[PDB]
Each structure stands twice: as structure tokens, then as C-alpha cells.
Design a protein around this nucleic acid. Structure first.
Ligand SMILES: Nc1nc2c(ncn2[C@H]2C[C@H](O)[C@@H](COP(=O)(O)OP(=O)(O)OP(=O)(O)O)O2)c(=O)[nH]1
Ligand SMILES: [Ca+2]
Ligand SMILES: [Ca+2]
Ligand SMILES: [Ca+2]
Length: 341
DNA sequence: GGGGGAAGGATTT
DNA sequence: CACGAAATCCTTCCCCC
């Protein structure tokens, strides 16, 4: 079982770079301006020239402006990146059929066939990096191991613009040397729940009774960590398919006024439908980010599809339902459509 | 007891 | 201060064999 993971480097930043070469070399920060005030918003991502000074995805634009005032700040253009991504995903098909597109810039290729050992894998890794750097002028980091989880950790260790093979000899030492927090799927919250159990490496999972672990982190993730530590993880690569579409927007001000909110909620629906393009959804949820970044949502599943007019009608009710309960002001508002016909 | 759908959340990338 | 989008998993509630 040989898995090849491809991760496009500082993707958005790099695309903006590609589209305007003069930018290369300078510190670039791709932003998402909320429009509340001046420079309100957050960082979608940044290139390494900015990354090394602490400017990273998540921080407010204002905190980034404070660290690197003379860096280039571009608005985020999601659509563009999307089409550059897909074109690259096509070039990857010319190397395998068994492909899983995890995100806008991640992909696992099952190449157990077209190879047989790692020496001929590290080669296909270079055939792919170079191929991509050529047709689209974009650098990627390749990771190669026996399963998706390790294929990915490989890339993490080798980025940016790198390639790495995690055979088996080392997979053994990693199950003991790797910090549990650096395991895909283990977030900050899960990483911390694992300290209170004495789990600081994968191996420590074998030392704990399964039930005390299922109670702390749930069964799924428990069976996940164990399988990996017990070195028998083998999830397959498969074609993932869109299950939901949506959009959440930020309001210029926080409010509880229905008539003051409806315009944002409607614009969200309008955009969601544009993206739905031909897909008919049976389920709708109205999501809201309260005044203290807490996520609230209400929904309804219908026996039939949902016409645009129905959606308008329903969303207004679901929002009212939200204001009925939570007495907190609303900062962000949006919708999501699922259960397509 | 346990299937199976719903809904509202939690957590991760 | 602190945007966005989508997946999976969890706990709870419910109708009913
Ligand atoms: N709006 C927004 N976009 C994000 C965020 N994190 C990642 N993205 C987007 C833009 C990133 O270029 C893209 C790929 O994510 P990583 O692959 O997580 O980001 P990036 O490629 O810059 O770093 P990397 O190549 O993985 O070392 O996803 C985020 O927190 N907010
Ligand atoms: Ca990544
Ligand atoms: Ca990446
Ligand atoms: Ca992690």
C-alpha cells in the first residue's frame, strides 16, 4: 500500500503570486476584509516571507498590519483559486484514477500499482512536482507513506516545496517519537484532552483501557488513534462528494433586529443558490455567529426539494427561532443547503 | 433493546 | 481584534417494532 499526498504550498498566496510575478520575493498576505471598519477582518493565508514573522492564517489583519506594515495586502479571490486548483487536480489524474480530493489543495493518490517500492515512488513524486511547477508554475510538497495519515505527516515534515518518504522502519519510531498533537485530526482541544490521560505519543494509546478513552474523546477518534498506534490503519482513497453548500457573511454591526439582519441572510441565500447550480437541496440550516464567536444554528429537512422562494420563507423563520432562544447579539449570519436530490 | 431519521453541537482542516 | 466553508462525529430526542 503506497500513498502519495500532494499539498500545494501557501496556496492562495502563491496563486496571487503566480498571477502577478512582481510579487514573488515580497511578503504577501491574502485577506478577508469584513468591511466592519478599516482593515477589519482576518488573514486567509500568507507566504513564507510573511510567515516567518508570525503573519499566519487566523490572526486579525490589524495584528498583521502591526508586524509588517509594508507587506502587500490583497483581498481574497476564492473563485480564481478554485479554478487553478481544479486544473491541477486534472494533471494529477494523469498519474492515477484512485484519487481523493480532501480540500481545495490537498490530494491523496493511490499509486500502489504504478510502483512497487519507495525508490520508484520518490521518483513519481519528482515527476509530479516538476510537472505541476511546469504546467501551472506552482510549488507543492509531496509526502509518501503506506496510508493517508502518514502520507500526510510526511508532507508536514517536508514543507514547503519538499518531498519526503516515511517508510516503515521510521513509521515504527514515529508511533513512539511523534507528538500526538501533530497527528492529522487531533486538534488543540483533543490534544489537551489527551494530556489528562497521559497520551503524549501514539504508543501511549495502547497503555490505556479502551473505555476510558471512548469516554474522553468519543469512539470514532478512539478507534482511529488506536488503529494508527497499533499500526493497522488502512482507510481507502475514494472520490469525495459535495454534501452541502453555503455561505456565512459578516454584518457591519452586531444586532438582534430581524429587518436589520435579513439583507445579509438573503444575500447569503442568493450566493448559495448561485453555487448550487442545478443541485436541488431538501435541507436548510441558518447559521449564526453570536456576539462572542459562538456558533448557533437551526434547520429543517423537507420531504421535497427547496425552491428559492421557499428558502427565503424558511430561513426567516429559522432565524427568528434563533433570536427567540439566544439573547446574544448576532455578528455573522448565513445558510447551508444539504441532502441534495 | 435497538433501527433510523432529526436536530443542535463539537472539533478539525 | 477574530473570516470562511465543508466534513465527520457526538449526544439527545423521538417514533415504534
Ligand atoms: N479563509 C481562510 N482560509 C484558509 C484558512 N486556512 C487555510 N485556508 C485556505 C488558504 C490556504 O492557502 C489553503 C490551504 O491551506 P494550508 O494548505 O492549510 O494553507 P497554505 O497552503 O497557505 O499552507 P501550507 O501550503 O499547507 O503549508 O486553504 C483559514 O483559516 N481561513
Ligand atoms: Ca494542508
Ligand atoms: Ca497546502
Ligand atoms: Ca493536528
Amino acid at each position: 500500500m503506497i500513498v502519495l499526498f500532494v499539498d500545494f504550498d501557501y496556496f492562495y498566496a502563491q496563486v496571487e503570486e503566480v498571477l502577478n510575478p512582481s510579487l514573488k520575493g515580497k511578503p504577501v498576505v491574502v485577506c478577508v476584509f469584513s468591511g466592519r471598519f478599516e482593515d477589519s477582518g482576518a488573514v486567509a493565508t500568507a507566504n513564507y516571507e510573511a510567515r516567518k514573522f508570525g503573519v499566519k492564517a487566523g490572526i486579525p489583519i490589524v495584528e498583521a498590519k502591526k508586524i509588517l506594515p509594508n507587506a502587500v495586502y490583497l483581498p481574497m479571490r476564492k473563485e480564481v483559486y478554485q479554478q487553478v486548483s481544479s486544473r491541477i487536480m486534472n494533471l494529477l489524474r494523469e498519474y492515477s484514477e484512485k484519487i481523493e480530493i480532501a480540500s481545495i489543495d490537498e490530494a491523496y493518490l493511490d499509486i500502489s500499482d504504478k510502483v512497487r517500492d519507495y525508490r520508484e515512488a520518490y521518483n513519481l513524486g519528482l515527476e509530479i512536482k516538476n510537472k505541476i511547477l511546469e504546467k501551472e508554475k506552482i510549488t507543492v510538497t509531496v509526502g509518501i507513506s503506506k496510508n493517508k495519515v502518514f502520507a500526510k505527516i510526511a508532507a508536514d515534515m517536508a514543507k514547503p516545496n519538499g518531498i519526503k518518504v516515511i517508510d516503515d522502519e521510521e513509521v515504527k519510531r514515529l508511533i513512539r517519537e511523534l507528538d500526538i498533537a501533530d497527528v492529522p485530526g487531533i486538534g488543540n482541544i483533543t490534544a489537551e484532552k489527551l494530556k489528562k490521560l497521559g497520551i503524549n505519543k501514539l504508543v501511549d494509546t495502547l497503555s490505556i483501557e479502551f473505555d476510558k478513552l471512548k469516554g474522553m474523546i468519543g469512539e470514532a477518534k478512539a478507534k482511529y488513534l488506536i488503529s494508527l498506534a497499533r499500526d493497522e490503519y488502512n482507510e481507502p482513497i475514494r472520490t469525495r462528494v459535495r454534501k452541502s453548500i453555503g455561505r456565512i457573511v459578516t454584518m457591519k454591526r452586531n444586532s438582534r433586529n430581524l429587518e436589520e439582519i435579513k439583507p445579509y441572510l438573503f444575500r447569503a441565500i442568493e450566493e448559495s443558490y448561485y453555487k448550487l447550480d442545478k443541485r436541488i437541496p431538501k435541507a436548510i440550516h441558518v447559521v449564526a455567529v453570536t456576539e462572542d464567536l459562538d456558533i448557533v444554528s437551526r434547520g429543517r429537512t423537507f420531504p421535497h426539494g427547496i425552491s428559492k422562494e421557499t428558502a427565503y420563507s424558511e430561513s426567516v423563520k429559522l432565524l427568528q427561532k434563533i433570536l427567540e432562544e439566544d439573547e446574544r447579539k448576532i455578528r455573522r449570519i448565513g445558510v447551508r443547503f444539504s441532502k441534495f436530490i
